[PDB]
Amino acid sequence: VNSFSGYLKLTDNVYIKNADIVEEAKKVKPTVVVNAANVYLKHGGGVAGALNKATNNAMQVESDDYIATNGPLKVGGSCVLSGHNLAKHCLHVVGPNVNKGEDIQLLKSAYENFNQHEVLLAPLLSAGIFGADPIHSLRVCVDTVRTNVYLAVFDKNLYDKLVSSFL
Numbered sequence: 001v002n003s004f005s006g007y008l009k010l011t012d013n014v015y016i017k018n019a020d021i022v023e024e025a026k027k028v029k030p031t032v033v034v035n036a037a038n039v040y041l042k043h044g045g046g047v048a049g050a051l052n053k054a055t056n057n058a059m060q061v062e063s064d065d066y067i068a069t070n071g072p073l074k075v076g077g078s079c080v081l082s083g084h085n086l087a088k089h090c091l092h093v094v095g096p097n098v099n100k101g102e103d104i105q106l107l108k109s110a111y112e113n114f115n116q117h118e119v120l121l122a123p124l125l126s127a128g129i130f131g132a133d134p135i136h137s138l139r140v141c142v143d144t145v146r147t148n149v150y151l152a153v154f155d156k157n158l159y160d161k162l163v164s165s166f167l
């Protein structure tokens with residue numbers, strides 16, 4: 001039993017809710033919140049900008065030190081950093097950004113990072129400003145993640161479309 005509330009169950013292990021991931025993280029305090037990161041951990045907009053703003057820029061400060069030490073992530077890769085006031089940990093995962101021409105097949109590799117964590121609060125990878133089709137992202141999620149994932153979809157119209165079209 002966990003504290004996630006109001007989710008629709010899609011499969012054995014995948015759940016979905018129309019929610020603001022920032023507000024959801026603030027209420028649940030999950031062990032892991034996933035950020036929709038880029039390789040430079042520059043949290044300027046989308047989910048990343050929202051999560052970073054909610055940490056009063058502490059996420060960005062920590063991220064800049066991470067990059068200065070380790071260099072950029074790979075597209076499809078991830079790193080674990082602090083969850084600050086939102087979660088115990090933040091799993092920064094880099095989905096391909098279609099608006100940069102990155103290969104969509106890397107979306108499966110990106111979701112594989114979730115399997116290293118038993119339970120996660122997450123957005124749909126490569127959705128929003130990353131330019132992928134969220135219906136496709138949900139399908140890859142369901143077919144790749146085996147651990148327990150609670151998906152927050154900010155846009156109510158999109159949430160209803162994802163549910164109604166789910167196979």
Ligand SMILES: O=S1(=O)CC[C@@H]1CNc1ncnc2[nH]c3cc(F)ccc3c12
Binds near residue numbers: 020045127152153158
């Ligand atoms: O859901 S969508 O709009 C349709 C694709 C987008 C995915 N992005 C998100 N997914 C979940 N929670 C979220 N909270 C946010 C706060 C912001 F300021 C900007 C984006 C988000 C967001």
